[PDB]
Structure formats: C-alpha cells, structure tokens
Symmetry: C3
Subunit: 489 residues, 3 copies
Amino acid sequence: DQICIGYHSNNSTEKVDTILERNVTVTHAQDLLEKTHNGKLCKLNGIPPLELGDCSIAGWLLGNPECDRLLTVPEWSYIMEKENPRNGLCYPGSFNDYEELKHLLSSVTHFEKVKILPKDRWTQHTTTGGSRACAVSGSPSFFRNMVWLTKKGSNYPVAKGSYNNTSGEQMLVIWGVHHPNDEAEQRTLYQNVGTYVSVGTSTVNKRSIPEIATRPKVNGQGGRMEFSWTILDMLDTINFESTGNLIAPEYGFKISKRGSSGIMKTEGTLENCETKCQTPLGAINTTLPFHNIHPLTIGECPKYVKSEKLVLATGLRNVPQIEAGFIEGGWQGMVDGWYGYHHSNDQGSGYAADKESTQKAIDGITNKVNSVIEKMNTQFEAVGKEFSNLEKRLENLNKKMEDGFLDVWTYNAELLVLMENERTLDFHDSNVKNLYDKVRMQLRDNAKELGNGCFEFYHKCDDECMNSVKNGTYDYPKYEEESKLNRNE
Amino acid sequence: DQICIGYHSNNSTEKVDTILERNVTVTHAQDLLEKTHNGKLCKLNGIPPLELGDCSIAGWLLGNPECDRLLTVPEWSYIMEKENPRNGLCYPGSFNDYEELKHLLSSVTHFEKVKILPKDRWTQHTTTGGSRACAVSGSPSFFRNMVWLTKKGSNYPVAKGSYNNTSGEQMLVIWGVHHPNDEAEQRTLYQNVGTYVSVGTSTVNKRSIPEIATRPKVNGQGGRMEFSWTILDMLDTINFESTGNLIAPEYGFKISKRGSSGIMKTEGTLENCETKCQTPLGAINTTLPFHNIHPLTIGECPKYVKSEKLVLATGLRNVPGFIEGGWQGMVDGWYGYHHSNDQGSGYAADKESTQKAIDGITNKVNSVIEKMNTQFEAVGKEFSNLEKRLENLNKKMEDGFLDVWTYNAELLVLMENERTLDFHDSNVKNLYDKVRMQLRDNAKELGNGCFEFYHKCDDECMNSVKNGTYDYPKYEEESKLNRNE
Amino acid sequence: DQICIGYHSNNSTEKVDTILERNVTVTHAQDLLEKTHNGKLCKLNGIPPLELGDCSIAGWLLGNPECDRLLTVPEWSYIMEKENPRNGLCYPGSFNDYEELKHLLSSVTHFEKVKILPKDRWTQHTTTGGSRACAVSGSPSFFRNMVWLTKKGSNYPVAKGSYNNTSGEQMLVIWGVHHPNDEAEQRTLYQNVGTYVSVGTSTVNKRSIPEIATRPKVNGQGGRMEFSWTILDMLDTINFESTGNLIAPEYGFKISKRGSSGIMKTEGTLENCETKCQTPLGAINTTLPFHNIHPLTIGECPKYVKSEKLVLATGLRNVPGFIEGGWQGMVDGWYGYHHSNDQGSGYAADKESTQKAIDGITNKVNSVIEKMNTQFEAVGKEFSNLEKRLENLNKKMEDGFLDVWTYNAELLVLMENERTLDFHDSNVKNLYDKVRMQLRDNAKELGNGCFEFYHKCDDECMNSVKNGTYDYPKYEEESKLNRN
Ligand SMILES: CC(=O)N[C@H]1[C@H]([C@H](O)[C@H](O)CO)O[C@@](O[C@@H]2[C@@H](O)[C@H](O)O[C@H](CO)[C@@H]2O)(C(=O)O)C[C@@H]1O
Ligand SMILES: CC(=O)N[C@H]1[C@H]([C@H](O)[C@H](O)CO)O[C@@](O[C@@H]2[C@@H](O)[C@H](O)O[C@H](CO)[C@@H]2O)(C(=O)O)C[C@@H]1O
Ligand SMILES: *[C@@H]1O[C@H](CO)[C@@H](O[C@@H]2O[C@H](CO)[C@@H](O)[C@H](O)[C@H]2NC(C)=O)[C@H](O)[C@H]1NC(C)=O
Ligand SMILES: *[C@@H]1O[C@H](CO)[C@@H](O[C@@H]2O[C@H](CO)[C@@H](O)[C@H](O)[C@H]2NC(C)=O)[C@H](O)[C@H]1NC(C)=O
Ligand SMILES: *[C@@H]1O[C@H](CO)[C@@H](O[C@@H]2O[C@H](CO)[C@@H](O)[C@H](O)[C@H]2NC(C)=O)[C@H](O)[C@H]1NC(C)=O
Ligand SMILES: CC(=O)N[C@H]1[C@H]([C@H](O)[C@H](O)CO)O[C@@](O)(C(=O)O)C[C@@H]1O
Ligand SMILES: *[C@@H]1O[C@H](CO)[C@@H](O)[C@H](O)[C@H]1NC(C)=O
Ligand SMILES: *[C@@H]1O[C@H](CO)[C@@H](O)[C@H](O)[C@H]1NC(C)=O
Ligand SMILES: *[C@@H]1O[C@H](CO)[C@@H](O)[C@H](O)[C@H]1NC(C)=O
Ligand SMILES: *[C@@H]1O[C@H](CO)[C@@H](O)[C@H](O)[C@H]1NC(C)=O
Ligand SMILES: *[C@@H]1O[C@H](CO)[C@@H](O)[C@H](O)[C@H]1NC(C)=O
Ligand SMILES: *[C@@H]1O[C@H](CO)[C@@H](O)[C@H](O)[C@H]1NC(C)=O
Ligand SMILES: *[C@@H]1O[C@H](CO)[C@@H](O)[C@H](O)[C@H]1NC(C)=O
C-alpha cells in the first residue's frame, strides 16, 4: 500500500527561453511568430493590383506614349511601382507637390476619366504639337491626356476655357506651363513675350510667368515643363487663361470608389493567388498573431516584430527518470493529465491523474496566453510615405519615429514572453509541490515518508480508502487506532 | 489550551484584475482613474477664457464687422473656437502661414492694440473704400483694423508709411494685397498697371505683384485679398511702400502678458464655475492621478490613459484557519493570532507584521504613481490642406505614445496585483511556519491551520509563546510526560 | 557533531533599490551608469575637430574676411559652432535652405576647394567691388569665395559662365542675388532695370528678379543679398546667365571623404586630448553601458538614460543559521555548509549551488545589458524661425523616446534586484530542506537552522551527507539505540 505524487512527461523536443535559463526543453509550446512567405505578388480579396510596370505615377496620369495600356484601368486593390521607373516625364520637367498627390492617391481606389475640355474646341490655335522626346515609331508625339497649344499662322489669341464640375464627385485636374530655352523659341511657338498662365477656382489663384534659361539637354531638349494639380470640389468651377505657354488638360480624373490602399515599391510581376494580405516580398497565409517579414503590409494580417523567435511554454519541463516521485522526474506512463497521482494498493496499481488541479492549471494557462495576445493588439502600424530631395529632415524624422516604435514594441513582446515563461514553469513546480503538501497534510502522521516525494501508509487501507484519499476525505478518527497499533511494531 | 492562526475578512465588494485571474474580490482597493466631468466650459483659476463665438482668429485680428464685441478684449486663459466658424474672412482671400501664427498665439495671453499708422495720415488717397461682402445695415463696409487705399481724383501717388517699435514689447503687424478680377477694375481702382507692394524690416524683404485672373464668385465677388504678417522686434522699424493694391494696417498688436494657454475646438458656451483644468468636454475636479476623458487638457490636472479600469488591490483576498479561510470578527490588523486560553479566548492579530506590510504596500503604491509621472502630454496643433503628411505624422506620434503609456500602466497594475496577493498569502504562511518552528515538538498539529499545545500553560505563557520568547527548557518535562500518556 | 546552513556575510556598504524596499545593503553590486566627464573638447580617434571660433557655417563657406584661417581646412571629426556666432553674413541678407545644407554637412567630412570660375575670365565687367560691411583695415572688401560683378565703363554686357563637373565627386555650388534699396543705386551699379539672374542645371531651373525696397540699415547698409545653393552631380553642367545683380562663385566644394559626423553647439575651445566619445560638455572614458551627461554624442559610447542611479545587486543581503543571519568567517563561497566533527570544526561552503547561482546571475546581468542595445539615439537638427511646429515635433519625439527607455531601464533594474534577493533566499532554504529530508528522522532539528544527529557520525558520514550519500539502512538500529 503506497501512493506517490508526480507529474506528466513525454518525448517532445521544443525549446523555450527564460529570463534566467537559456534553451530549456519543455513538454508543450505555442508558436506566435510566422517567418515564411510564398514570394509572389498576387490578388487581394479578388481584386488584382494596378501594375504600372516601367511607368511612373506621373507618366500614367499624364499619358506617356509608352504607358498606353493604362489609358483605361479597372478597380484595383493596391498600386505596384518600381524604385526607379524608366518611363516618367518623357519631356523633361518637374511636378509640383508630387508627394502630396501620392499621399492622396494612397487612399483612392478606382478613377474615372471624363473629357472636360475636348481637343476640338481650340479652333483659334494649333493642337498638333509634339516633341521627339515622346516619340512613337520615330515620329514626334506628345502626352495622350494633354494638349500643347501653339500659334496658328502668326497669332496667339487669348485662350479661355472653363469647366463646371457636375460629375457627382471630386475631380483631379492637372495643367502645365512650358519654359523654353531662348527668346527665339518663345517667338517661334507663341509669337508673344511676357506671356502668362492664370488658373483660378474658388480656393485657387495662380499666375505663372515663364522662366527662360540656358540648360543642358535631358532626353535631347533644353526646355522644361512644370506641372501643377488641384482637386475640384462638387459644383465648383475652374477657369484657364493664357497668352502663351499653356499645356492644357483634356481629361479630368473623377474619384469614384475610395477605400484603403497603398503604393508598393517592388520589382516583381503579378501572379495568380487570392491572399488576405500582401508584403513587398510575398504573401502571408497564417493565423499566428505576429510576423517578421516586412514592416509595410496591405490587407488584414498580423503585427510586425523585429525578432527571430517567439515561443510560449505552455507545459512542463522535460526531465525524465534516468534508467518514483517529483524529486527525480516525470513518468512516461501518465497519459491522462499533467499532475501525477500514482497509487498502488495490495491488489494492484494505477495511473489516475487528478482533474481538479488539471482544469485549474488549464484555465490559468489559457487566460495567460489569451492575455499575452490581447495586450499586444494596440501596436504601432507603419504607413508608407514619400519625400522629396529637399525634405531630408522630415524623412529622417519619419524613419526614426517608425524605427523607434518598432523597437519599443519588439522589446515589450520579447520581455513579456520571457517573464511569462518563467512564471509558468515556476507555477507548475509549485502546483506539484502543493498537491504533495496537501497529501502530506491530510495524511497527518499515519505514514512513513520515503523521502522520494511520497510515504508508505502506516494505516493499511484498501482501494476505497486510497480512492477517498484522492477525493480528499481521509478521515483520521476512523483509522487512527489500528494505524497506531501497526506503528507500535 | 490551544491557539490558531489566520487572517482578516470583511464584506467589501471590490473587484481587481490579475494576469492569471480576472474579477477577483478583495478586501480593500484604491481607484486611480477618474471618469467624470461636469460637462461645462468655464473659468480657469478665476480668469475667464476668450469666447470667439461664430468668429475665427483671422476675423478677430482683422476686425470683421460681425466680430465687433472683440474690439477690446481683456486677459484670458484659453481661447474657444468652433470647428467651422462662419464669420472669418468676409472678403474672400487667403492668410499666409496661418498655422504658424496660431502656434505663436497658443502661448500668448493679453494683447494691447496700438494705433501705429493713423487713418488720417493718408491725405493723398481715399480711405473710405469697402465692399458689400462685409456689409452692415446693407451699406458696404470693410475690416475695422485695415484701410483700403484707392485713387483720389485720377492719381495714385507712391504711398509710404513707417513705424518704429518703441512700445516696449514685440508687436504683431498684418498687411494685405488685393487681386482684382480683370484689368478694367485695376485701372478703375488704382489708375496704374504693373503695381507692387513692398514691405521692409531688418529681417523681412518682400515685393509682391498683384495677380489678375478670372475666378468664380465667393460671397459675391471675384476678387481676392492675400494677407501676411510679421513680428516686430523692439526698437526695430517697418517700412511700407506701394504703387497700388495695398491694404495697410492701422493697428498693431503688442504682446503684453505671455504664459501658457491654448486654442480649444469646442461648440459650447461659457458658464459660471471656477475649475483647475479644462477639457473640450468639461472640467475635472479630482485628486486621483489619472483620467480618461480627452487627451487635450489645459491647466494642472492628471495624466491621460486610454483605458476603462485601473484599480489597485491594496488588501487581501476576500473569502469568508489559514487553510480554511478568514475570520469576520477580527478588526485589529491583517495577520491573526487567534488565541484561546483555559479561562478565556481572544481574537488578537499580529501587530508587528501589520505595520511592515502597511509600509511595503504604501511604498509600492507611491512607486507606481511616481514611475508614471514622466508621461507624454499631447499638445494641440493645426495643419493646412497641403500638409497632410505632417498631420499624419503628428497624429501617429501622439497615438503611439498614448498606446505605449496605456500599456505600461495596465501591465504595472496587473503585475503589482499578482505580487500583492501572493505576498499576503506567503506572509500568512511564513507566520504560521515560524509559530510551528518555534513551538518545537511541544504541540499537536490539528491540521486545520493550527496546533494543540502539548504543554499546559497560562495567559502569560501563551503571550510569551506568541511573543517570540518561548522558553523551551521551562515546561518540557510535563509536556513529555503528557505525550507519553 | 553538528552541521548547520548559512550564507556568507562581509563588510560592504553598497545600497540598492527594489519595488517594495528602498536603500537595502547588499554584499556585491554592479554599477551600470557613468556620471563624470573631463569637461574638455578634444580629438576623436586622433582626428581633430574643425573649430569655427566666432564664424558661422555660412560665413565659413562664403568666405567672411574675418574667417581667413579657414580658407584651407584638413579632415575633421566634427564641427564646433557657437550658439550665436558673431561673424556670419557680413553684408546683410539671407541663406535659402540653410538648415538643409547643415543637415547635409552633418554627414560630410573633408571638402576640397576647386576653382571653377576664375576671376579673370570676366573680361567685360568689374570684379573689384566691395562694401564697408566687410572691411579689412578700414578699406572695403568682400567675401573671398564670391565675385561681385558691376559696370565696366558704362555698359553691363550679358554675363555667361558654365562648368562641367569633371572633378570626380559631387560638388556644392553657391550663388547669390543683390537687392538694392533704390533705383538710383541699381542704375549706378548696373545701368539696367528689370534685370534677371538665371541658373540652370539638369535638375534645377531658376530665374530671379531683384526686389527693391526701402529697408532699415543693418550693419550700415540698406541692401540685402539672397544666397542659394545646389549639389552638382558627376559629369553634369551648371549655366549662369544674368543681366545684373549677380554674385558669382569662384570656388566649388568637392565632397571628398564622407562618413559619420555632426555639428556641435559649444562655447569652449580645443584642448590636447584623445578620446572616443565626445559630448558638448566633455569627453567620456568608460566601459559601462549607460551614461547621463548629454543626449547628443559623437563617436561610439554608451546609451543615454535620464536617471541618477542604476545599480544592480549581484550578491546576497548583507546582515550580520539562515534563521538568524550570515557568517563573517566564511570566505569560501555564497551558500555555507558549516560542519563540526568531534575532533575539529570547519567552514566549507557548497560547490554545487554556488556555480549554478553564479551562472544564473551572470546570465541575467548579460541579458539586462543585452535587451537595451536597441535603444533610441538622438540626432541633432536645426529649424528656422517659420518652422516652430516641426521643431516642437522633433523635441517631443526625442523627449518621449528618452523617457520611455529610461522607464524601461529603471523598472528592469528594480525587478532584477527583487528577483535576485528572493532567489538567494529560496536557494538557501532549499539546500536546508534537502539536507533535512536526506537526513530523514535521525536527528533533532535544533531550530536555528540545523539539527543534532541522533546517532554519532564521523568525518566520513559528514562528507557523505555533504555529498548527498547518507544511507538510512546503513545506520538506523544504533540510532534507535541512542533514541532511548
Ligand atoms: C511644337 C513643338 O513641339 N515644336 C518642336 C519642338 C520645340 O521647338 C522645342 O524644341 C521643344 O523641345 O522641338 C523639337 O525639335 C527640334 C529639333 O528638331 C531641332 O534640331 O532643334 C530644336 C532645338 O534647338 C528642337 O529640339 C524636339 O522636340 O526635338 C520638335 C518640334 O518640331
Ligand atoms: C473701392 C471699392 O471698394 N470698390 C467697389 C468694390 C470693388 O470694385 C471690388 O468688387 C471689390 O469687391 O466692390 C463693390 O462693388 C461692386 C458691386 O456693387 C457690383 O454689383 O459688382 C461689382 C463687381 O462687378 C463690385 O463688386 C462690392 O464688392 O460690392 C464695392 C465698391 O463699389
Ligand atoms: C455650375 O452648375 C451648377 C448646377 O448645374 C450651378 O448651380 C445652379 O445655379 C443656378 C443659378 O442660376 C441655380 O438656379 C441652380 O439651382 C443651381 N443648381 C444647383 C444644383 O445648385 C452653378 O451655378 C454653376 N456654376 C456657375 C459658376 O455658374
Ligand atoms: C527708433 O527709436 C529708437 C529710440 O527712440 C532709436 O534708438 C536711438 O537711436 C539713437 C541714434 O540716433 C541713439 O542715440 C539712442 O541711444 C537710441 N535709443 C535707445 C533707447 O537705444 C532708433 O534709432 C529709432 N530707429 C530708427 C530707424 O531711427
Ligand atoms: C562634360 O564632360 C563629359 C566628359 O568629360 C562629356 O561627356 C562626353 O561627351 C562626348 C560627346 O561629344 C562623348 O563623346 C564622350 O564619350 C563623353 N564622355 C563620357 C565619359 O561619357 C559631356 O558631354 C560634357 N558635358 C557637356 C554638356 O557637353
Ligand atoms: C559696387 C559696390 O560695392 N559699390 C559700393 C557699395 C554699393 O554702392 C552699395 O552701397 C552696396 O552696399 O556701397 C559702398 O558704398 C558702401 O559704403 O557699402 C561701397 C561701394 O563703393
Ligand atoms: C514521440 O512520440 C510520438 C508519439 O505520438 C511519436 O509519434 C514520435 O515519433 C516520437 N518522436 C521521437 C523522436 O521519439
Ligand atoms: C541553446 O542555447 C544555448 C545557450 O546557453 C546555446 O549555447 C546553444 O547553442 C543553443 N542551442 C542551439 C541549437 O542553438
Ligand atoms: C492557406 O493555408 C491553408 C492551410 O492551413 C490552406 O488550406 C489554404 O488553402 C491556404 N490559402 C490559400 C489562399 O492558399
Ligand atoms: C468579471 O470578469 C469575468 C471575466 O473573467 C466575466 O466573465 C464576468 O462577467 C465579470 N463580472 C462582472 C460582474 O463584471
Ligand atoms: C471639488 O470637489 C471637492 C470635493 O472633495 C469640493 O469640496 C470642491 O468644492 C470642488 N470644487 C469646486 C470648484 O466645486
Ligand atoms: C534611503 O532611502 C530611504 C527611503 O526608504 C530614506 O528614508 C533614507 O533617508 C535613505 N538613506 C540615505 C542615506 O539616502
Ligand atoms: C581611460 O581610463 C583608463 C583607466 O581605466 C586609462 O588607462 C586611460 O589612459 C584613459 N584614457 C585616456 C585617453 O586618458
């Protein structure tokens, strides 16, 4: 007649980390970090992205002749753009407030091209101008969405054009101004000097003056074109007026759908998937609450931590018995619960595992795991932004902010996991010791402690007796006289 | 003749949170979060705020005809401004560097209007101009702080004006430039084309040419007015020169008091109170160190946490015999020494561990409060339509710091609660173990958390047993004889 | 024949902090914070810094006559600029994108001055103009690196100049425009009204018209000069064209070395040192992982925390059996195993738990130093008068991150110390429990922390118990014999 106290063990091999010990082998572990991706760019919830290819955003919106497959684009989930696109402004120039326009586009889904100023309304000027920088099949051409107004004969009459926005949504309009490289070019193209371009809306007032300068040749020309933009409100009017150097719009872009999107800098192409979220290096298909692939993601998928390992120990330490109690190790034969309650009566033995402590431990560990997951859902999420050449201070500020927040949250996650692992292992050891202490307490003094975490009963009992002791109903006054009689021997 | 060991219980109904357990009832608890406000917008240490009503800052500084109650304003503590004010720039136009001026005003109290260029000094131009955009009683009018200079007869001579800042402090000066909607209006108003407006200080140099375009009608007019500003230093002069299109100032604004203030975006009005801090939703009157009402506060009052519950467990687990529960009759302390002599009984606690635990828990509470008084404070700012990246950066920074500090506070509270509960349980267990050890073998452990004396003693002997002065070689012989029976 | 358990005590006076307790005396302590400096500005890795003295960066680049000691400058480690330099723009004016240029300079080591437009090529103008706002020995003078172009006789022909960047690296070029204070001065300098200044490169296009206005006399003159800059790429070209009001450059600044550097705001001078980290107050010479002198540092050196005390308790609580306190006689280890046989006595410690405790504590100390290596580093920046919101954003970001990391470090140290002390107490108690259990019932626990053997042992039994080889069946019958 003998019972003992122990704990479950098995043959697993996962390793966990703790604030004191390094690489401790445990029984069960839960993984929280995803470190794999399929390395493909592909669809988001069924809507394919917008593949610019070798074109830039400016070349798309202006109608570069090489970007002729984007003249009508369906709805998109995100925009794919290269780091150094080859096809942008075919005719050299600038694009004022380019990055603000990109920030606006980062949350704009489907466009809709509306002809606001048809090319045939300019009956007092010339509209067939073109440059060899934007050339198709050897002949000169121009942007497909803009009109280059030149003189007709020897006159450049005052050009006027107005549009009232009755489309039903906000409209994006882009105009431009030409800067020649001498006075002869100006007189050859517009037959006027001291010309101007004036644009006016309810919140816009501009009067540009051409700036003639001598410059090197970019794409073969010494002239430059400056492009500006505005967002026209519903039922608002826009007016154009110029005595020269006007690159007038023909189309206007109507914001149609709106939503959450972004601009991804990648060098890959489009394949066939259906993913939930996408990173510049690939697509993620996981249920784990963390990943470490790339800080910038689009869609619905987990948080980013700059760590190589995050494992939560949800079990016991793996120390077996080399070659019968908790002071040596765990038993392989326990396949019922965690905390061992090995018993051995006269007729036989058994390996019944306690349930009152097992369920309490399970509830505790599940609450701990859920809490660890839940306190980290208010993380910092990075949002992409573009900056110009004369905005290095602001770009450094943004980079430092994002990096600092990522570092803080990585530190938080790692430390929380380490401390929770320590507390879990200590808690399990304490639970084994507490069950042993409860057994010894209810036993009183009617058993000789063998020193291996259990005691041979000084009261000779039966299956009912040991079962009741397991239930916690060992009545000392019922079995004190006979036990004392045996102890007197 | 026996004694027992336990702890204290009562009938409180406070619930605290823990890492492994949630909603645990405790004896005593201390709240740290304030969640109530009076819903009123009212005074700050006896100084009323500046109520702009339906007016904007530009309307107040330029003297809109509808903001005529703010011509002379007393000292304030903060400013109330609506989200989309109605009476701003009556004549359509723009205000350059508006957000920078508002940032400057955010830390400026009382002004002092100084008449720097009197209207009568322009004896070569007409100063009676005005528009029906800013109309009072139907007739045209103009801004009350600015002068519209137009032609007199058929000339617009070169207009000059200088001021030397001998007022005694920095002064804010505002001027403007007019943009007509065609050339005919320009000749009808100024007689000249290709005009300019030039302003000169010791650090400002500007030459503005009017821009003529065709524009829709806003407030009935197709023209626009562009306004600019500068801060004049002491003993520094400002020069004005123009051949046309000049809207000259008549008043400068002297900075007089300075201090800590702000601009609060609210749509309410001013009531009668006297509070110590103000939020855009109402005042706060509390001595607790945290609040969760609004991130932007003006005054001296607690830190903001984006949570819903912050309760610190300062007592013991509330379960109604240290291996069986607690006692409802003990009112002395936390750690009990239930004592029962032959002729009497008692319920005295232990008065040495109680003060140690009180000191430890008080130090812990003060340390929790102390570690969190270096938090991050949000500061209001304004951004324009073409500054969306900067606005996004500011909002993300403020939100990130708020989330970080909320996480820190919640983790601290949970870990401290876990430690406190285990600390009290371990203290009770350690006291019982000390009693069992010092009693040696002269006791029969009943098992219910206390033993039965194997030596027969009295009230003084039992007091010595509890007092750490258990003299073993005193009464061990009769105890041995008794256990031998 | 008694054996007792205790922990070693000594005569140290280092105090540490904890969540529950304050000012607790410990045996051994590790300090992590460095709080002193030599208060000297001096060399970093053998390369001296660049000392502008009373000159600003603009004054250094433009060639202020007072900054004639900086005409040629060797390689440098950092730049020393006063908060309010006195010798900057001798002729009043402004510098466009000054802070961007300073940010660019912050990561730029040695410059190399290249003569890109000699002064004698302007054979149709006068190149000897100057002002009394930049005067040397009473006579008028001008910036050394710039040329002021004026009338030659009574004509001002169109000025043209070009440069093709064949130097080998990127180049910085600075030009200017002059704004007179009346029409008469413009005519007496240029014979042209409505002039322009045109600059064009492959990525830069500009045309500036002079602005004339009446202004207060700063430094004696009512005119102003506006200066602009650009970075010219390899094998690129810059063209200058102007009908008047042109301040042409004579030199360009080739970027020669590059590296990690910074601009430092101090009022001191250079002394004869050698250091590896430099803060604006002085140098740092340490092997510790933290410091609290100044947030902005140049070189390699520890992290900045805004605390005055970071001490880690690596030992046991210092109070003079474990149920009474420590032992001053023990010098063996940390956990004691006092034995005393009939023939003699002893003070031997335990060789098993001591190594485990040392390994764990060292692992934890190294971990604490490891988790703070991803800290936040401040980088200096400059902002203009119309950029107060950006300045406030930068200040708040830096201060918030510093506060967050300071909080992290202090909390980690406090929890570490509590865990260390509790761990030592638990280890002592568990060794005592192991001895008590393996001894079984063949002794009477004295009470102070040890037992009195019920059967007389010898030295062999003593070190057998110490080695965990006490055998109950080998000795129980005679033990029960002395039981009576
Ligand atoms: C209306 C128009 O596009 N006209 C020209 C165009 C412009 O005159 C301007 O130069 C824009 O670049 O220029 C194009 O042609 C030219 C060459 O054929 C000529 O040898 O050199 C010119 C410069 O001196 C100019 O480059 C051009 O885009 O190359 C074409 C078009 O006829
Ligand atoms: C010196 C002056 O204030 N002159 C006009 C003024 C300007 O002509 C300009 O329109 C600035 O508002 O405008 C006022 O006059 C006019 C109207 O009464 C009329 O119906 O429409 C005019 C424009 O076509 C002009 O606006 C005005 O704003 O009411 C007043 C004053 O006569
Ligand atoms: C742009 O179009 C809108 C609608 O087509 C015009 O708004 C109308 O203005 C007239 C004024 O004669 C009113 O009678 C209508 O009731 C308005 N319609 C709506 C829907 O508001 C607007 O005036 C046009 N813009 C301009 C500058 O004429
Ligand atoms: C503006 O007024 C101040 C004070 O009246 C002038 O400062 C004085 O300048 C004279 C030079 O003629 C000195 O002798 C005085 O000592 C100055 N006064 C003080 C208090 O310093 C200043 O010159 C005036 N500004 C202009 C442009 O004339
Ligand atoms: C600036 O100089 C470079 C070389 O020093 C010029 O590039 C050369 O251009 C000629 C054209 O006649 C080519 O034959 C050479 O092969 C080019 N050299 C190299 C290294 O590419 C460049 O053209 C010059 N800039 C200008 C505006 O002429
Ligand atoms: C070409 C030139 O530098 N000319 C003269 C300038 C200008 O006329 C303006 O004053 C600009 O300062 O001014 C001085 O008279 C002067 O005392 O500063 C010096 C010089 O004779
Ligand atoms: C561990 O035991 C499991 C029993 O489910 C078995 O499938 C697995 O192969 C074992 N692994 C090793 C390494 O013995
Ligand atoms: C486990 O961690 C220990 C650190 O004590 C390290 O020495 C060992 O290499 C690690 N194991 C593996 C497989 O990396
Ligand atoms: C994601 O992975 C699961 C495996 O858990 C798989 O069943 C599912 O098909 C995957 N989704 C896609 C879109 O491939
Ligand atoms: C207390 O919290 C628990 C969460 O474990 C929740 O189930 C229970 O409803 C809560 N009770 C009250 C009264 O809020
Ligand atoms: C704030 O509340 C306290 C209650 O403790 C009250 O005595 C005090 O009058 C209140 N303050 C005001 C301004 O009403
Ligand atoms: C140590 O800290 C305690 C705070 O508990 C303080 O009372 C005591 O004065 C301090 N001692 C010294 C020497 O600073
Ligand atoms: C730094 O301190 C050490 C002392 O550990 C000393 O040997 C060394 O010379 C010091 N460095 C300098 C540059 O003085």
